[PDB]
Amino acid sequence: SSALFFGNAFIVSAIPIWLYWRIWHMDLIQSAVLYSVMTLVSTYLVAFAYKNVKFVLKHKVAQKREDAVSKEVTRKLSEADNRKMSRKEKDERILWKKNEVADYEATTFSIFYNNTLFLVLVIVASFFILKNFNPTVNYILSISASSGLIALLSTGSK
């Protein structure tokens, strides 16, 4: 799970580089290091944001899965095995599997929410703020601001 989270964070932080790869194509032999370092720092910040958001939303997700918990209760109990089962282990196993699926769905939702928020302000920034500043500096600052806001929306400790 840690490895897949690592890879997902890196790929979602690198896909902006994927769309910025051939769109301008300025000195790749020298801009590759800049792209790598920005991707790494964005990956770290977005991973911190993902951890914070999943931790804060797990409280709601606990009761969000209650209907599915009861649905699995129905099947785990509607059997002659449940007539002479442990009568408690069933609850433990269904809680474990529902927690696992809840964590998976919550992480997916958070990752894609941050990804969707990533490509909202960057386009308008590159379209407008280039009037007075260098386009490359504008793209760099837009990416930095997007990463910072993605990190800050997690905790929100204003």
Binding site: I15, W18, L19, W21, R22, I23, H25, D67, A68, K71, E105, T108, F109, F112, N115, T116, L119
Partner: protein, 48 residues
């Protein structure tokens, strides 16, 4: 000596990774469009 100088600048982004450029840029991210909807539909079918 006559030459008509105009400040006309236009942007054409990468055709492959305006219309084609922006369309390709928008359709680049496939999972973000389907996977959340896939999870929503899975939850709906598990609840409905």
């Amino acid at each position: 000596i006559g030459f008509t100088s105009a400040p006309g600048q236009g942007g054409i982004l990468a055709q492959r990774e305006h219309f084609l450029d922006w369309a390709a840029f928008g359709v680049m991210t496939l999972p973000s469009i389907g996977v959340p909807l896939l999870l929503w539909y899975s939850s709906k079918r598990k609840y409905d």
